[PDB]
Design a protein around this ligand. Structure first.
Ligand SMILES: *[C@@H]1O[C@H](CO)[C@@H](O[C@@H]2O[C@H](CO)[C@@H](O[C@@H]3O[C@H](CO)[C@@H](O[C@@H]4O[C@H](CO)[C@@H](O)[C@H](O)[C@H]4NC(C)=O)[C@H](O)[C@H]3NC(C)=O)[C@H](O)[C@H]2NC(C)=O)[C@H](O)[C@H]1NC(C)=O
Ligand SMILES: *[C@@H]1O[C@H](CO)[C@@H](O[C@@H]2O[C@H](CO)[C@@H](O)[C@H](O)[C@H]2NC(C)=O)[C@H](O)[C@H]1NC(C)=O
Ligand SMILES: *[C@@H]1O[C@H](CO)[C@@H](O)[C@H](O)[C@H]1NC(C)=O
Ligand SMILES: *[C@@H]1O[C@H](CO)[C@@H](O)[C@H](O)[C@H]1NC(C)=O
Lengths: 107, 131, 49
């Protein structure tokens, strides 16, 4: 698993390693090792209750754009292994849970 | 609300049948599809196989129905059952609710649409180690 | 001498199609059926592919 992060006060704009081919719809989760995790943003525009405005929202129009994940208000929870749960038309089912990315915070 | 609690044996003899059940409350067969999460301490994330609401069994295509899934709905102890187990497929059996939503990009009659799969609730899971 | 071949598509794969009016086609077909009935000794007109 490849780490990618940045020091505090700067947004770690991790972009999904997968490339969007065709129509896209991504799912975003706040993971926890060995326990039950939750979801943060499961669509290009969905902002469920309890989710602040810290997340950037890119509408899925004019195919060719990239799905990038940026976060703020960093805490202990976000260091867990993120999973970019993506679905695209041509590639079909994604049996893997996407590119497993982890956030490393030190200071 | 959805509550999770497993009742797995915790120990399995090699090449023997398993029955890992999960207790769920507040819902029935039709509302939630039932997938299962594969996980282990310091291991990857996968779907080895899972059951549909209509008792249809869907598996990892590389797995090709190595295990057979049956369950019980009256007890709400929906079961993922493993046949001919191995340390390769040793994983904690999260009981996961599955819901489907669809993104339509083209004419529906032609078949141009796909489901964007939502993952809301994760099971607690049980740990089984092969002897 | 250059030969232009078909390249791979980008984006979502889609099928070609042709949209024809909902009721105007049936209206015109009914009128054509009436005229054919006039010219064909008042028989029932059946279309087949
Ligand atoms: C010939 O007639 C057929 C119908 O008989 C017609 O097919 C219809 O074509 C339109 C456009 O090509 C399709 O409209 C699509 O509708 C979906 C949802 O309704 C949209 O999906 C959303 O897209 C937005 C951004 O684009 C996204 O944010 C959102 O998440 C998506 N999902 C939802 C739930 O909103 C598509 O974007 C939209 N397509 C376009 C190009 O905008 C219809 O789905 C087709 N089918 C039907 C039954 O209407 C066809 O266009 C006609 N051809 C001509 C040349 O007129
Ligand atoms: C038709 O087949 C050829 C070869 O099987 C494909 O060419 C490959 O294209 C991918 C990327 O598009 C490259 O990574 C491979 O190295 C190519 N292979 C070779 C042997 O050159 C071609 O893409 C296929 N066409 C379509 C539309 O899928
Ligand atoms: C075809 O295009 C014309 C003009 O763009 C439009 O008025 C008509 O409704 C279209 N046909 C159908 C079946 O929608
Ligand atoms: C058959 O139909 C035509 C047109 O509708 C009409 O003119 C003709 O009189 C009909 N035949 C008879 C025997 O009435």
């Amino acid at each position: 698993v490849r780490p990618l992060s940045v020091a505090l006060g700067e947004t770690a704009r991790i972009s999904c390693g997968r490339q969007a081919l065709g129509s896209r719809a991504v799912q975003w989760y706040q993971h926890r090792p060995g326990q039950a995790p939750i979801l943060l943003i499961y669509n290009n525009q969905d902002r469920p209750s309890g989710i602040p405005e810290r997340f950037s929202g890119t509408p899925d129009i004019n195919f060719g754009t990239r799905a990038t994940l940026t976060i703020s208000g960093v805490e202990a929870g976000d260091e867990a292994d993120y999973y970019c749960h993506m679905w695209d038309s041509r590639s079909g089912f994604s049996w893997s849970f996407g590119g497993a990315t982890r956030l490393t915070v030190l200071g | 609300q959805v509550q999770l609690q497993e009742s797995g044996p915790g120990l399995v003899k090699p090449s023997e049948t398993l029955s890992v059940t999960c207790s769920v409350s507040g819902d029935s067969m039709n509302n939630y599809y039932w997938t299962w999460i594969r996980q282990s301490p310091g291991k990857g994330l996968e779907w080895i196989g899972y059951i549909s609401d209509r008792e249809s069994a869907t598996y990892n295509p590389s797995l090709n129905s190595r295990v057979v899934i049956s369950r019980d709905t009256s007890k709400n102890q929906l079961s993922l059952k493993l046949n001919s187990v191995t340390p390769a497929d040793t994983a904690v059996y999260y009981c996961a609710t599955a819901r489907r939503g669809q993104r339509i990009y083209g004419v529906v009659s032609f078949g141009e649409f796909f489901y964007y799969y939502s993952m809301d609730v994760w099971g607690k899971g049980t740990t089984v180690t092969v002897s | 001498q250059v030969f232009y071949k078909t390249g791979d598509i980008i984006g979502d794969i889609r099928k070609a199609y042709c949209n024809i009016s909902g009721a105007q086609w049936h209206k015109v077909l009914g009128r054509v059926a009436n005229k054919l009935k006039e010219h064909f000794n008042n028989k029932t007109i059946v279309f087949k592919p």
